[PDB]
Structures are given as C-alpha cells and as structure tokens.
Design a protein around this nucleic acid. Structure first.
Ligand SMILES: [Mg+2]
Ligand SMILES: [Mg+2]
Ligand SMILES: [Mg+2]
Ligand SMILES: [Mg+2]
Ligand SMILES: [Mg+2]
Ligand SMILES: [Mg+2]
Ligand SMILES: [Mg+2]
Ligand SMILES: [Mg+2]
Ligand SMILES: [Mg+2]
Ligand SMILES: [Mg+2]
Ligand SMILES: [Mg+2]
Ligand SMILES: [Mg+2]
Ligand SMILES: [Mg+2]
Ligand SMILES: [Mg+2]
Ligand SMILES: [Mg+2]
Ligand SMILES: [Mg+2]
Ligand SMILES: [Mg+2]
Ligand SMILES: [Mg+2]
Ligand SMILES: [Mg+2]
Ligand SMILES: [Mg+2]
Ligand SMILES: [Mg+2]
Ligand SMILES: [Mg+2]
Ligand SMILES: [Mg+2]
Ligand SMILES: [Mg+2]
Ligand SMILES: [Mg+2]
Ligand SMILES: [Mg+2]
Ligand SMILES: [Mg+2]
Ligand SMILES: [Mg+2]
Ligand SMILES: [Mg+2]
Ligand SMILES: [Mg+2]
Ligand SMILES: [Mg+2]
Ligand SMILES: [Mg+2]
Ligand SMILES: [Mg+2]
Ligand SMILES: [Mg+2]
Ligand SMILES: [Mg+2]
Ligand SMILES: [Mg+2]
Ligand SMILES: [Mg+2]
Ligand SMILES: [Mg+2]
Ligand SMILES: [Mg+2]
Ligand SMILES: [Mg+2]
Ligand SMILES: [Mg+2]
Ligand SMILES: [Mg+2]
Ligand SMILES: [Mg+2]
Ligand SMILES: [Mg+2]
Ligand SMILES: [Mg+2]
Ligand SMILES: [Mg+2]
Ligand SMILES: [Mg+2]
Ligand SMILES: [Mg+2]
Ligand SMILES: [Mg+2]
Ligand SMILES: [Mg+2]
Ligand SMILES: [Mg+2]
Ligand SMILES: [Mg+2]
Ligand SMILES: [Mg+2]
Ligand SMILES: [Mg+2]
Ligand SMILES: [Mg+2]
Ligand SMILES: [Mg+2]
Ligand SMILES: [Mg+2]
Ligand SMILES: [Mg+2]
Ligand SMILES: [Mg+2]
Ligand SMILES: [Mg+2]
Ligand SMILES: [Mg+2]
Ligand SMILES: [Mg+2]
Ligand SMILES: [Mg+2]
Lengths: 156, 185, 148, 53, 222, 51
RNA sequence: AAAUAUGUAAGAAGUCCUUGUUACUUAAUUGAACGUGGACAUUUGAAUGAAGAGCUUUUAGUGGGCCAUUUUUGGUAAGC
RNA sequence: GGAAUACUGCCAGCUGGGACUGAGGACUGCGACGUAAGUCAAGGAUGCUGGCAUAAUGGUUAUAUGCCGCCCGUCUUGAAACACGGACCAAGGAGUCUAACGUCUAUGCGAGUGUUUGGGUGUAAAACCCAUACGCGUAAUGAAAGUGAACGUAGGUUGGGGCCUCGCAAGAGGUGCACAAUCGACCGAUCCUGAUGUCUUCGGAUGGAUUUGAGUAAGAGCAUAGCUGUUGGGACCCGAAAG
RNA sequence: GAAAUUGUUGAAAGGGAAGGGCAUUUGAUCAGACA
C-alpha cells in the first residue's frame, strides 16, 4: 500500500431535508401600481420607455404595453422593482386582458395570435389615450435624466 | 475581555480512565462505566474510579485486614470487594468463610480463603451477582504506610527521616540532632 | 530513549529551557558538597540535620558477623513449620508430643515477642529470647531450650 | 441574640408559628406624608462673599 | 401499546391547565401594577390638596451596568464588581437595595452606571436578553417550562412570574435574581450623551446613580 | 438552535405569556385613567411660587 | 483626636436540663476539665458571590527591575 | 373659566425604506389561527425566473494603486539604534552516555523479591533451565554494654465514602475501610521508683515522669522499565592569563 | 550535477534603496465542477 486506508468510512446515505416552514404568500404591490398607470421603464431592452400598466401576473410580473403602435413596445412582462410608477393614469375598463398569464409567455419570429392580441388591446387603449391631449406624444418619447434632475426630489 | 475570577481551561484533575494499558482492565472499566451510567447505585460509581487508581493509590488489602472487617457488627456475611491485589498473612491463625471480590489474589491469599472454604470472585463475577453492589463491604489498604511518605514534610521539628543511604552512627546524628552538638533538629 | 526526551522539544528555542538571564553555566554553587557550612547551610540543617561533627565510639576492625542475630517475632514462629505439618500440630496441642522448632536452623538468632500465638505447646530452640517471648511461649505450655 | 432567639421561638412555636429571626440590613424607608401645618417651608439661598478678620 | 395520543392526552391537557394558571396570574399582576401606580398618583394629589407632601418610599431595587473596561482597576472595587457579577463592560445585573449593598454600590460608582429600572425595561430586559443559569451553561429563557423547572420551587413558573419577582423585590428575590444570568447589553445606540464617560452623571459624565434616567440608557443598550 | 425575540416575534410572545392576547384585545396599553379634579391648597401654590 | 487602613465575632464543633469520672482543685462531691442520659431543625439565625471545596508530592525559571497617581526621606535641583 | 400645546414616560398600536446572515437536515417540543377539516411566520430559507457552462466565477502569480510596515539575533529597566555577531551559499555544528539517586508512572510477583558471579543447555554472544548463597525488605533504639513492640474486640473520641436496616419519598438509625484530628497503651534511650532473692553486691520485679527515637499498634516490599530531577565524570558547545 | 554566483534569451517594473501586510484593477497562468 501507498497509504494505509482509514478505519472508518462515511456513509454515503444522503439525508432528507428537515421539513421547512416557508409558505409562499402573495405579493401585495405598492399603492402606486394600479392598472392603467403609466410606468417609466428603468432598465432592460425598453429602458426609459413610457408605458401603460395592464395586469399583475401570477409570477409577480407586470403586464404592460406601449401601446406598440405608439412607442414600439409590445404586450410584455416587466418586473415591478424596475419601474417608476408615475402619477398619470388612463382608464383601462375597456381592455380585456383576462387571456394573459404566465403560460402565455412560454418560450417553447412572431405568432400571429400575439400580433392580433396586441392589436385588440392597443386599440382599446389608444381610444382612451386620445382623450387627454399630448399623452400619446408623452407615451411616444423616452424619459431621461436631464442635468439638474434629482430623482429623490422629483414627482413622477 | 473578562475579569476572570478563575483559571481558564482548567483540567478537572481526576483520572478519567486508567493510565494502565491492560485489555482486561479496560473491559472491567467498560463494564462498570455502563453500570455506573444506568444504575444510580453509588457502589458502581466508586468502583469505576478505583479502577483508574495508580498502583500507589491501590495499596494491597490483606487477608487479615479482611478477616477483621468481618468482625464488624452485623457484617460477617457481606462480600468484601477489593479493587486491587489481596495478599496473604500468616499472622492470623483462623480465617472466616466469606466471599472476596478483587483484582488479584496472591497465591497464598487465594489459598487461605479457599482453604477455609470461601470464594475468590473477579470484579465482573461480582457485578453479575450484585449489579447494585448489594451486600458488599468495600475495603482499601493503607496508603500512608508507603516507605516514601516517611520523608514527606522533612524539616526542622517535623520528625520525618532523612533521605539517607547508609545508616548508622556517624550518618546524620550529630550537629543539629542533639543538644550537645550545636543544637537539635 | 532519545526520541521521548525533552531536548528534542527544546530544539528551536534559544536557551534550551535554562533561561536567558541566569544561563546554564559550569558550576555556580561550587562542585559537589562544597559550602555545606556556608552558602549551602540552609539546605543542610533541614534536610540533613546531624551531618557535621561526631558522636560515639570509633570501633577499629569491626566485623559484622560477630553481631549476626536476625530477629524472629512470635508473630510468625509457626511459619517455620511446613504448612502440611503445621496444621497437624495446631490440632493436638500437647505435652508428650509438641513440635520442635530450631529457630537457629531457620537462621534466626533471637526470638522476640510481637503478638499472640495460639495455645498449642511449642518447643522452641533459640540462641536468645526476649523476656516476653519466652513468657508468651510458656503461657501456651511450651518451653524455650537454649542452643548454640 | 441566641438567648433571645430561643425565646421568640418558643413564644412563637407554642402559639401558632410565624417567626422571622434572622437579622436584616437597613431597609430603605417607606412612603410618608409630611405636613405643612405648623411648618411651611423656609426658603434659603446662598450667601455673598465676606471677610471678617 | 397506547401512549400514541393516550399519554399525549395526559400531557397536552396538563399543559393547558398550566397556561390557564399563567393567564390568570399575569392578569393579576396587571391589576397589581396599575392600582399600585395609580394609588401613588392619587397619593401625591391627595397630599397636595391637603397642603402636605407625599414623599415616596426610596427605591428598593436598582439596575447596574459595568461601564468601565477590565484593566487598571483597584483591588477593593474589583472584588465587588465580581461579587455583583459585573466582569465585563456593558453587562448588567439587578440589585436589591439595603445598607449592605448600598455600600457596595458606593464602592464601585466610578465604574458603573445604575438607576431605578421601570417595569417596561425589566420586561424587555428579561424577554430579550434574559438567560437562566442551569448547572451553569446559561440557557435562554424562550420557554416557560425552563423557568418552572428551576424556579418553580419558589412559586414562579413563567417569564412573567420572574419579572414579577424582580420588580416587586419578592420574598425570593435572591434565588430569582441569581437565576438570571448577567445581562449582556450592546453599547448604547444613541451614544452616551456626554463626551466623557468617567465622570459622575451629575458632573456631565456617565457613572453613578442617575436614577430614572437609567431606563433611557439601558433601553438604548438593550 | 436560534433565539427568538418575543418582543418582535408574535408567535413566541404568545407562547410565553398567554395574557398578551387579551392585553392587546382590550387595548390596555392605552388605558384611560379616571378623570378626577382635586386642587392643591394655596399653601402649596404659594410656596411653589414664593421666592 | 479623625478619614484610610486593622483584630475578633454573626451557631449542629450550637444553646438548655439531668447528674458520672479524677491522683488536679475546694472548708465542702465544692470546682475544673472530659463525659453518659434528655429538649429544639433549616428565617439554623446578616449581605453578595461561589465554572465547587480540601489535601499531597515533585520540579522549572526568577532572585540587576523600571514607571504612573497618591503618601514620602536626602538634595537648590535632576530624565537624580 | 375652559381648551390646546410643549416636555417626559408608556402601549403585549399599526406601518415604510436599507443592510448583513440562512447554521441545521425525516419525524419528535412550546404554541398560534380556525365551529371544524385544516392551516401557520410556532425546536435555523424556501418559492419563482434568468444568464453562463467557461477562464465567466475562483485560485495562483507579476505589476499598479490606497492605507499601513525600521534589522534580525542578543544581553538589558529600556535597541531600529551613534550597543555586539552577521558580505553570500552549501556541508558539518551544541543537554549526551555512564555510576548511584528523589518524586511520579506502567508491569511482574508479594512478606517477600531479584533466572543471566556462576551451572545446565542451545538452531550458539540469542532463546530456554537452575543449586547454593547474597542483596534489599520483613524491627526498632542506644555513644555503648545492651534491651526489644496487645490492659483492651490491637483502645476511646470526632468527621468519614460505601454498605446494612426502616420509610412510597424526605428522612431516621446500624456499621463504618482509606484518610484527618485528638486523647491514650506498647518497644528502645533518659530519669525516678527498687518487691521476691542474693557467692553482700549482685540481681532489677513493679509502678511512674512538662524528656526523647528515622519506632509497635492485622506487614508493603523487591525487581525491570520510562519521562523529569540530583551528584560525580571532558558533562550542553566553543574560550583564558597560568601551573 | 543543488546553492551562492554568472552569460544569453523572454516578460516586467524603476523621479534619493529594495523587500513586506490587507485589498482590488490589469496581464499571464491554472484546477475543479457542469452534464
Ligand atoms: Mg407549514
Ligand atoms: Mg405583500
Ligand atoms: Mg414612435
Ligand atoms: Mg516498616
Ligand atoms: Mg537546643
Ligand atoms: Mg536516561
Ligand atoms: Mg529514540
Ligand atoms: Mg518526537
Ligand atoms: Mg517544550
Ligand atoms: Mg521547536
Ligand atoms: Mg519559550
Ligand atoms: Mg528547565
Ligand atoms: Mg543565552
Ligand atoms: Mg561527614
Ligand atoms: Mg513481624
Ligand atoms: Mg446582586
Ligand atoms: Mg435609537
Ligand atoms: Mg448612528
Ligand atoms: Mg437618531
Ligand atoms: Mg473629547
Ligand atoms: Mg439594539
Ligand atoms: Mg475589614
Ligand atoms: Mg449564590
Ligand atoms: Mg459549582
Ligand atoms: Mg519550585
Ligand atoms: Mg526554586
Ligand atoms: Mg534558587
Ligand atoms: Mg542575575
Ligand atoms: Mg440551510
Ligand atoms: Mg443547511
Ligand atoms: Mg465556449
Ligand atoms: Mg476549466
Ligand atoms: Mg463567457
Ligand atoms: Mg509583488
Ligand atoms: Mg509608514
Ligand atoms: Mg548580547
Ligand atoms: Mg545599559
Ligand atoms: Mg543612538
Ligand atoms: Mg559584548
Ligand atoms: Mg561586523
Ligand atoms: Mg549568518
Ligand atoms: Mg545542515
Ligand atoms: Mg534450541
Ligand atoms: Mg558464541
Ligand atoms: Mg532445558
Ligand atoms: Mg551447588
Ligand atoms: Mg540487612
Ligand atoms: Mg529501613
Ligand atoms: Mg544490663
Ligand atoms: Mg544493635
Ligand atoms: Mg475521650
Ligand atoms: Mg449515620
Ligand atoms: Mg457509632
Ligand atoms: Mg516508653
Ligand atoms: Mg537518649
Ligand atoms: Mg531506620
Ligand atoms: Mg553534571
Ligand atoms: Mg592554556
Ligand atoms: Mg600553556
Ligand atoms: Mg599554582
Ligand atoms: Mg558530470
Ligand atoms: Mg513577469
Ligand atoms: Mg494579492
């Protein structure tokens, strides 16, 4: 022998986990996040895009859209902690949105259904937006920080 | 930091196994630390310790010291336990019966005991008959009959015997050992 | 053996465990038993009172042999009879026939009297006896016969 | 104190217990209501420097 | 073999009595405390009405924090700081006030901060940083059976029974308070007040009896 | 294995001390004491405002 | 005539009753010492603490010390 | 007259932001919510999602940058010292062995113990075996001549583990080894006492004494071995001037 | 066929020494683990 070999070996029996106590309970969202609310997108592909909030999905994400025809953002998921909820609000009582859940974004270019779903939602919304002048323009132009802007001060 | 009030990391200072390296001794210890953990009987607790005892703290109990202890009032039927060797003693002329349970019996002792129709039991046979040590009479030998302790505490007016090799007149019996030679002790 | 020894352990510490201040030097107190009466007197009186000076008589050409004379106490005595034979004499304690013990033949020169022997008669042959030994022996109906 | 502790005990025991005969340090004092009636507070202040000599 | 739920029944039910006992007991003390506190309030007012003065009894209980580190300390104070179990900085214990401890306090004033603790800070001292001494070891309180086990002999079978013994300086305060392992506070959050700790409170410092201002501090360290 | 602060973990608060439930239920930590109006003797007020 | 320091005491090895021993001691079975027999438990005799207490053997290094507050001698003084 | 408010204190009132940590690994406990079935934040993190699957993270290394860092060895109260040795590198380089010992420990046997001077024998310096002595121990105390260890259950007292008896238990009693304290008895020395007797100066019983011993008072030793310690030896290594 | 110490080659750094510690950038270099 090169080396003696031990008198004792470990068992190679993995134990089982202790029965943990961690209930997944639901995420209540900050009050500023009601649907119809315009969000500023802080990060990601469409960062600094101004965008309408539609539905809280079951994976906590937010359903938004541009509308696509306004500023080029499609029906989409966005994470609530990367989002400045502004104080300006369109009514969204005419937008169905039931259809839309987590499975609807199962990875598995673009499905015609998406392209149509996008149109039906966006039309309801546009109908609405047009009620308040300049909103469309607003929605269609990126937000940015101008010199002198101090986030911890501005009202959004 | 802590104003300590007691020396930190102190070892309790008690043997806690024997320093001995004997299988059989270790087995007897295996036996008794089991009995001591599971029988709340004080006897098992005392025996466990006595097994750790070094040779000196195990003076030999004699067969005559044994015989005497049995002349204790109401004690003549008890089984004497001795955690150490048991030696013979020609000086007693008549020996009782009983049952001595011990580590070692010298040839002469085991005979004397058995000659008067007693029993010599090992501590483990003792266990199987008296797991709570029932009816046992533990004896220990003279610890301070050792030659060495004569010289402990040597100094003026203590009376304790020189560490000395040769002895006789003119070996440390003059100046400081008598009034007429300087002084005395 | 060297491997178990504390100099192995001191390797790498400067002073071999004998101090930086007071070193290990050749013979600080002097050699041997020097100074017994001077710088080493506290250790001598205490620990060796009695050491200096003289007592009693010189004895030129003392021959230990002259004074050979081992003691045996009654305390044993019955030991000098072989076991077998011994028990045989204890029972049947009697004049007419009692055991003869040559204690010189066992190589003792004096019987002293330490402590109790049963009432069996012994005939005890010795060079010398304490008064008590010889007393205790008669009290069992034995005697002491003086030999040489 | 012993001679007396023996007393208060017998005096207690053969009555109906309740003893308490260890010694106790000065307890802090209790509440109390001091009256003003006959004794309104007099108000002092400190005094100036002087030299008498 | 029964036991399954069978001697599970003998016990959960048994446990239930015990809580009830605590529930009514803690309800008791709440009364005890309120009407005590109110009676004093009404005392003061009643005496003022009458043109007199209500002088409260002197406090019978204080709370001491060691405030000084561990080095350069004279021997007499030292011993005392040990006998009061304050052998490291910011640790604290309760002390029943009599002449014979009062002097002890007197002896260690440069090295401690102490005062009259309120119900509130005795409660939060005990609930959060309170540990028992149990064959030594220092065991968290955190369940009531830990107390009944060791203090139950003296009445006292809940964390609130404990608090109650301390604060009212009960007949069994010695056992109750010794059971409590010396509290271990962190340094004060707000800071100390003061730019130098080792003068007396009264001189702008931190040490000594600072009376009812002991609760502000201890809370910031608890 | 892990000490839990009753002062800020309601479960073990209710584990030690069952009275916590009723204390809270009866607000109790905000009890409205009896409104009475004893006024102090002018002796008191005079010597308070004396020099 | 202080302050600071400092001796002893705060019980079971304790308190009470009864009445044995001796060559000491008394005018004296008087005393002194040591006892036998009987009465009373932890509020059994202040506080606080006690990672327990007691005991034994053997042996190293060390036996140039220096500093600070206070007390303090010599010196004009000194990092004396 | 009637409010407010400040100040201090309390709440087992509610509630937002931020940071670090996530030890443990079936179940077992104390609980909380529920009419209930269940549920839970109650004896220590899980759920969901994505990116990479490689120098990406990580290690090593060189450099750069922020803050920090005096030359080690030594003797000394105090050294980075304007105190000493050391230019560099390899290789040697200092508490040893022996006689005789103390304490401790392990082992054999035990009132004994030690086969190895020698003898027998041998697969030959081994292993195996052994008669007689000797050594140390089993007796002490005196300068010596010399004498020499039970009044007693080998003593009384007090504490004492353990054990025994009673009691469901707490406790109460019985016995009590080691050990400790204390008062006594025994042996020798010393000093008194001086019976029966006597080759009339021998003999020294008996009972004593603030004296005294390294003693007795139901033995503990002998031997091998080890660490540490002791003495003599070149004696941890190197060093005089000298004789 | 080590080391001191040397030549060459390659890479680096260098405003009155150099070497070191915590940390990270940058270059170089590399183990493991993925499935
Ligand atoms: Mg659960
Ligand atoms: Mg939520
Ligand atoms: Mg556009
Ligand atoms: Mg001896
Ligand atoms: Mg003298
Ligand atoms: Mg050696
Ligand atoms: Mg070796
Ligand atoms: Mg080694
Ligand atoms: Mg070492
Ligand atoms: Mg080393
Ligand atoms: Mg060292
Ligand atoms: Mg040394
Ligand atoms: Mg040196
Ligand atoms: Mg000599
Ligand atoms: Mg003998
Ligand atoms: Mg205290
Ligand atoms: Mg704060
Ligand atoms: Mg702060
Ligand atoms: Mg603040
Ligand atoms: Mg300052
Ligand atoms: Mg805090
Ligand atoms: Mg004092
Ligand atoms: Mg205590
Ligand atoms: Mg303890
Ligand atoms: Mg020493
Ligand atoms: Mg020394
Ligand atoms: Mg010395
Ligand atoms: Mg010196
Ligand atoms: Mg984990
Ligand atoms: Mg884990
Ligand atoms: Mg790749
Ligand atoms: Mg790789
Ligand atoms: Mg990559
Ligand atoms: Mg570098
Ligand atoms: Mg620097
Ligand atoms: Mg030097
Ligand atoms: Mg100098
Ligand atoms: Mg200099
Ligand atoms: Mg020099
Ligand atoms: Mg040089
Ligand atoms: Mg060098
Ligand atoms: Mg080398
Ligand atoms: Mg052969
Ligand atoms: Mg040969
Ligand atoms: Mg043969
Ligand atoms: Mg022969
Ligand atoms: Mg001899
Ligand atoms: Mg001897
Ligand atoms: Mg003579
Ligand atoms: Mg002699
Ligand atoms: Mg007595
Ligand atoms: Mg008893
Ligand atoms: Mg008795
Ligand atoms: Mg004598
Ligand atoms: Mg003499
Ligand atoms: Mg001797
Ligand atoms: Mg030497
Ligand atoms: Mg020379
Ligand atoms: Mg020469
Ligand atoms: Mg000469
Ligand atoms: Mg070659
Ligand atoms: Mg490079
Ligand atoms: Mg680095």
């Amino acid at each position: 022998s090169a080396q003696k070999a031990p008198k004792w070996y470990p068992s190679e029996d993995v134990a089982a986990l202790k029965k943990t106590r961690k209930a997944a309970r639901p995420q209540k969202l900050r009050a500023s996040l009601v649907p119809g609310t315009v969000l500023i997108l802080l990060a990601g592909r469409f960062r600094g895009k101004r965008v309408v909030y539609l539905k809280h999905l079951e994976d906590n994400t937010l359903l938004i859209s541009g509308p696509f025809k306004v500023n080029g953002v499609p029906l989409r998921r966005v994470n609530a902690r990367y989002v400045i909820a502004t104080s300006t609000k369109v009514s969204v009582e005419g937008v169905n949105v039931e259809k839309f859940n987590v499975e609807y974004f199962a990875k598995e270019e673009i499905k015609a259904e998406r392209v149509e779903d996008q149109k039906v939602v966006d039309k309801a919304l546009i109908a609405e937006i047009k009620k308040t002048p300049l909103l469309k323009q607003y929605l269609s132009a990126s937000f940015s920080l101008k010199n002198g802007d101090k986030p911890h001060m501005l009202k959004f | 930091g802590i104003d300590h009030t007691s020396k930190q990391h102190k070892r309790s200072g008690h043997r806690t196994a024997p320093k001995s390296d004997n299988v059989y001794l270790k087995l007897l210890v295996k036996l008794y630390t089991f009995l001591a953990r599971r029988t709340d009987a004080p006897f098992n607790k005392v025996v466990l310790k006595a097994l750790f005892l070094s040779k000196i703290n195990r003076p030999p109990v004699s067969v005559s010291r044994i015989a005497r202890a049995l002349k204790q009032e109401g004690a003549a039927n008890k089984t004497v336990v001795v955690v150490g060797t048991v030696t013979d003693d020609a000086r007693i002329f008549e020996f009782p019966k009983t049952t001595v349970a011990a580590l070692r019996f010298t040839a002469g002792a085991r005979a004397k005991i058995v000659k008067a129709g007693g029993e010599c039991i090992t501590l483990d046979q003792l266990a199987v008959r008296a797991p709570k040590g029932q009816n046992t009479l533990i004896l220990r030998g003279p610890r301070n009959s050792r030659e060495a302790v004569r010289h402990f505490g040597m100094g003026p007016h203590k009376g304790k015997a020189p560490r000395i090799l040769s002895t006789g007149r003119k070996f440390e019996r003059a100046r400081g050992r008598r009034r007429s030679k300087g002084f005395k002790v | 053996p060297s491997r178990f020894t504390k100099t192995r352990k001191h390797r790498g510490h400067v002073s071999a465990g004998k101090g930086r201040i007071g070193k290990h030097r050749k013979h600080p107190g002097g050699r041997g038993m020097a100074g017994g009466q001077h710088h080493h007197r506290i250790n001598m009186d205490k620990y060796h009172p009695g050491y200096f000076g003289k007592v009693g008589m010189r004895y030129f050409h003392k021959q230990q042999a002259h004074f050979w004379k081992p003691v045996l106490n009654l305390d044993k005595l019955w030991t000098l009879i072989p076991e077998d034979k011994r028990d045989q004499y204890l029972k049947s304690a009697s004049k007419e026939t009692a055991p003869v013990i040559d204690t010189l033949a066992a190589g003792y020169g004096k019987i002293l009297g330490k402590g109790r022997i049963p009432n069996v008669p012994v005939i005890v042959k010795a060079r010398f006896v304490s008064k008590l030994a010889e007393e205790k022996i008669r009290a069992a109906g034995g005697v002491v016969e003086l030999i040489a | 104190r012993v001679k007396a502790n023996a007393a208060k005990r017998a005096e207690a025991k053969a009555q109906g217990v309740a003893v308490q005969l260890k010694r106790q340090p000065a307890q802090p004092r209790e509440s109390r209501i001091v009256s003003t009636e006959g004794n309104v507070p007099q108000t002092l202040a400190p005094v100036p420097y002087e030299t008498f000599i | 073999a029964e036991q399954v739920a069978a001697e599970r029944a003998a016990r959960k039910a048994a446990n239930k009595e015990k809580r009830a006992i605590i529930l009514e007991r803690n309800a008791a003390y709440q009364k005890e405390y309120e009407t005590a506190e109110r009676n004093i309030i009404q005392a003061k007012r009643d005496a003022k009405a009458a043109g007199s003065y209500y002088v409260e009894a002197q406090h019978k209980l204080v709370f001491v924090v060691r405030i000084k580190g561990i080095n350069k300390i004279p021997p007499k104070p030292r011993k005392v700081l040990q006998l009061l179990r304050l052998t490291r900085i910011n640790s604290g214990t309760f002390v029943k006030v009599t002449k014979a401890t009062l002097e002890l306090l007197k002896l260690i004033e440069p090295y401690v901060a102490y005062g009259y603790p309120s119900y509130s800070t005795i409660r939060q001292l005990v609930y959060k940083r309170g540990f028992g001494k149990i064959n030594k070891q220092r065991v968290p309180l955190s369940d009531n059976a830990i107390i009944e086990a060791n203090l139950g002999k003296y009445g006292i079978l809940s964390i609130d029974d404990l608090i109650h013994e301390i604060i009212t300086v009960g007949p069994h305060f010695k056992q109750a308070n010794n059971f409590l392992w010396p509290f271990k506070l962190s340094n004060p959050s707000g800071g100390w007040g003061v730019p130098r700790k080792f003068k007396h409170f009264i001189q702008g410092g931190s040490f000594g009896n600072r009376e009812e201002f002991i609760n502000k501090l201890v809370k910031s360290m608890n | 294995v892990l000490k839990k602060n009753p002062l800020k973990n309601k479960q073990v608060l209710l584990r030690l001390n069952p009275y916590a439930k009723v204390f809270a239920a009866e607000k109790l930590g905000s009890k409205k004491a009896e409104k009475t109006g004893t006024k102090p003797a002018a002796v008191f007020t005079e010597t308070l405002k004396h020099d």
